[PDB]
Design a protein around this ligand. Structure first.
Ligand SMILES: OC[C@@H]1[C@@H](O)[C@H](O)[C@@H](O)c2[nH]c(CCc3ccccc3)c[n+]21
Length: 435
């Protein structure tokens, strides 16, 4: 038996473009994920977020699933171009109304909204002006965030500026695998820097607008282990929270990031560091897998290990979640931490019995929840844990071919089938831990 602290926030998480569909409904502007996925060759099977889980219509049912499962928190994101179709200036009341209804429904059901302000669907109109490459995005983002705080901050008290700014910068602008699909290392590091400035500006406005709320930021993290007996030190500093937390807490990028990337950063990047240090209330960590890592003349390659893997091909390494939780306290001692995403893709099928017997996912969640428990026992101020995801959904460049949900979605009918893992999780939430 592993019981969690009183009032521990058990959650599930989604993102607007991945679940909503109807990207252009009710006066919404195009996002970069709309244009990226409608470009041939970018997404597996030519899949797009045009329909997705149709959450844009089915939102009430979906929240009723959250309620029935007894889940206590919902992390969801807001589509920037639903709110400001051109990115700045005009505010679309119908986009505000869409999320207002979600927010009021969650509150009425006593479910705590965690709102991710940016989970990757930049307005296309701002991408035309360079998007994350343009320093002015700190102003655009601040204006957007202000709108959200002004309209929703009376009810929503827990806010996340950015989901996984490393992914946004590097996967979007160096690897070219995500929107806006670019491969320029100088643009990618200017996006890193501008994401920090935009984050800090948004926190600054939050303090002026929502005096009773909490705001944080979310980072992706891998558990990197050395193949033999430094490449690990670099992967952690670059791929994990330190890329952003070293600026936020210490006023500079980490040491091995500067060694590799100084030339790609703006020359006078330090001038912005004072503002980047804006105080945050919590850190969200997303964690999924581990990686065997070796020097290789970025001077690092991964090494395949046996290990059970998910359908993503991601090595299942549960002690990784413990390690990253301990490590973030050891390095930056944030006052609160949340696991804002943890989950697994498996090749789910509906059995003849009408059920989805995803024991593989139960095993994955159970193992990680157990390790997060361990971290709490050794003093990590973990305040919550969010399963990625409530629903099978549009998995970015993998399209619909990867299912991460604890609820199965039959996309032909939009039927939701609660998976064994969903039922299992509901029991964990009800009991406030494992047994
Ligand atoms: O891959 C599953 C989930 C996504 O559906 C979420 O939107 C996103 O927040 C998220 N981040 C990660 C870990 C970082 C990552 C992103 C993209 C590709 C590979 C790793 C895994 N996930």
């Amino acid at each position: 038996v592993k019981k969690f602290p009183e009032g521990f926030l058990w959650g599930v998480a989604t993102a607007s473009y991945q679940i909503e569909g109807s990207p252009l409904a009710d006066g919404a502007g195009m996002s970069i994920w709309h244009t990226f996925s409608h470009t041939p060759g970018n997404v597996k099977n030519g899949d797009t977020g045009d329909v997705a889980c149709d959450h844009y219509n089915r939102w009430k049912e979906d929240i009723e699933i959250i309620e029935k499962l007894g889940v206590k928190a919902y992390r969801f994101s807001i589509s920037w171009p639903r709110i400001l179709p051109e990115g700045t200036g005009r505010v679309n009341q119908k986009g505000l109304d869409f999320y207002n209804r979600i927010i009021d429904t969650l509150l009425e059901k006593g479910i705590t909204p965690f709102v991710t302000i940016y989970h990757w669907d930049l307005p296309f109109a701002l991408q035309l002006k360079g998007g994350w490459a343009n320093r002015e995005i700190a102003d655009w983002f601040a204006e957007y965030s202000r709108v959200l705080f002004e309209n929703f901050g009376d009810r929503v008290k827990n806010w996340i500026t950015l989901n996984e700014p490393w992914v946004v910068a590097i996967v979007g602008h160096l690897y070219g695998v995500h929107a806006p699909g670019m491969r320029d290392i100088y643009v990618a590091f200017r996006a890193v820097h501008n994401l920090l400035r935009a984050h800090a500006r948004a926190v600054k406005v939050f303090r002026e607008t929502v005096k009773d709320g909490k705001i944080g930021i979310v980072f992706n993290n891998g558990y990197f282990e050395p193949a033999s007996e430094r490449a690990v030190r670099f992967m952690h500093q670059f791929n994990n929270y330190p890329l952003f937390l070293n600026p936020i807490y210490r006023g500079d990028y980490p040491e091995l990031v500067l060694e590799f990337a100084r030339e790609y950063l703006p020359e006078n990047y330090k001038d912005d560091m004072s503002e980047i240090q804006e105080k945050i209330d919590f850190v969200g960590l997303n964690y999924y897998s581990g990686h065997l890592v070796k020097f290789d003349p970025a001077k690092v390659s991964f090494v395949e290990r046996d290990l059970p893997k998910t359908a993503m091909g991601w090595e299942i390494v549960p002690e990784g979640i413990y390690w990253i939780l301990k490590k973030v306290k050891e390095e930056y001692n944030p006052p609160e931490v949340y696991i804002t995403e943890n989950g697994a893709a498996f090749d789910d099928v509906v059995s003849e019995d009408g059920r989805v017997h995803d024991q593989n996912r139960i095993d994955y969640l159970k193992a990680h929840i157990g390790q997060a428990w361990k971290a709490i026992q050794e003093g990590v101020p973990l305040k919550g844990y969010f399963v990625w995801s409530l629903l099978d959904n549009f998995e970015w460049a993998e399209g619909y071919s990867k299912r991460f949900g604890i609820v199965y979605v039959d996309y032909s009918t939009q039927k939701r089938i609660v998976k064994d893992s969903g039922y299992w999780y509901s029991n964990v939430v009800k009991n406030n831990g494992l047994e």
